[PDB]
RNA sequence: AAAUUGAAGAGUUUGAUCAUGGCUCAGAUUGAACGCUGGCGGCAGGCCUAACACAUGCAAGUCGAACGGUAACAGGAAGAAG
């Protein structure tokens, strides 16, 4: 159904011979609510054009991650530039406890219950990339049963 | 059976960026103090400072079934005044 979220709107400037020229960047996320997450980074001279750029960039580059009934599979460490995200699956209930950008990514991802923490720089673009890296780093019991070459019950016990 | 189901960030260095890195904020608490305000009840608490100096009153007595006794009080026995 492709629900959409706007995370950050930044104003950046490029200096020229006349003076400063200001443009606006938008960081967005889209998601199915079931597994599929995508993030977009648009840049335009005025704001809603940058929002529309970020949305049509985010809708293309979406990756699907695996997740249980509303939860993760294991603890997983996502990393990026200055961001050292750590997300732990949850018990049921308790909502998404996560800060800001990571909260928006996990909410469009369909992750209902999570315990998350950001380390290092909490810059929004880099923590969105660290979050989605930790999400696509995650692996399922059926795929780790496909790897090690045995049924899932012999792994879980 | 149960004995715990646990983890949020933001602002500020720049023309703008990303890092590093301080500073500050959002919470909970207290033997609290002060300012404005003030209906009641329950249960707790109340010199953190001068281990400074203390007026006044009380805070350790009991036992006659240990004893000599007998000041009180209470009767007794007697002698009396009526």
- How many angstroms separate the CA atoms of A75 and A78, rounded? 10
CA A39 to C1' B39, whole Å: 58
Which residue has the closest alpha carbon to B15 C1'? Answer: A15
Nucleotide nearest A71, CA–C1', reads: B5
Give the span between the Cα atoms of A134 and A80, in whole angstroms. 10
Tell me if residue A87 falls in helix, strand or coil.
strand
* Three-state secondary structure of A7-70: EEEEEEEEECCCCEEEEEEEEEEEECCCCEEEEEEEEECCHHHHHHHHHHHHCCCEEECCCCCC
Q: State the residue for tokens 């530039």.
A: A81
Whether the CB-CB separation of A109 and A31 falls below 8 Å is answered with yes
Taking the CA of residue A100 and the C1' sugar atom of nucleotide B34, their distance in angstroms comes to 39
Structure obtained using: cryo-EM
Nucleotides of chain B touched by protein CB (<7 A): 5-10, 15-20
A82 φ, ψ (degrees, to nearest 5) = -125, 10
The gap between A131 CA and B46 C1' (Å) is 54
The resolution, in Å, is: 2.9
Residue with tokens 């792994």: A155
Distance in Å from B18's C1' to A81's CA comes to 9
| A47 C-beta neighbours (distance < 10 Å), count | 15
Tokens of A107: 């909410």
CA of A34: how far to CAs of A40, A100, A126, in Å? 18, 20, 23
Which nucleotide minimizes the distance between its C1' and the CA of A89? B6
- What's the CA gap between A57 and A92, in Å, rounded? 33
Contact A42, A53 (CB under 8 A): yes
């Amino acid at each position: 159904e492709l629900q959409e979220k706007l995370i950050a709107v930044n104003r950046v400037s490029k200096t020229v011979k006349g003076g400063r020229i200001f443009s606006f960047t938008a960081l967005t996320v889209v998601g199915d609510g079931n597994g599929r997450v995508g993030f977009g980074y648009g840049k335009a001279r005025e704001v809603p054009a940058a929002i529309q750029k970020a949305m049509e960039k985010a809708r293309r580059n979406m990756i699907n991650v695996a997740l249980n009934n509303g939860t993760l599979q294991h603890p997983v460490k996502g990393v990026h530039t200055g961001s050292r995200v750590f997300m732990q699956p949850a018990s049921e209930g308790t909502g998404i406890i996560a800060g800001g950008a990571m909260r928006a990514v996990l909410e469009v991802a369909g992750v209902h219950n999570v315990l998350a923490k950001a380390y290092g720089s909490t810059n929004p673009i880099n923590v969105v990339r660290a979050t989605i890296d930790g999400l696509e780093n995650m692996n399922s019991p059926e795929m780790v049963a496909a790897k090690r070459g045995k049924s899932v019950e012999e792994i879980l016990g």
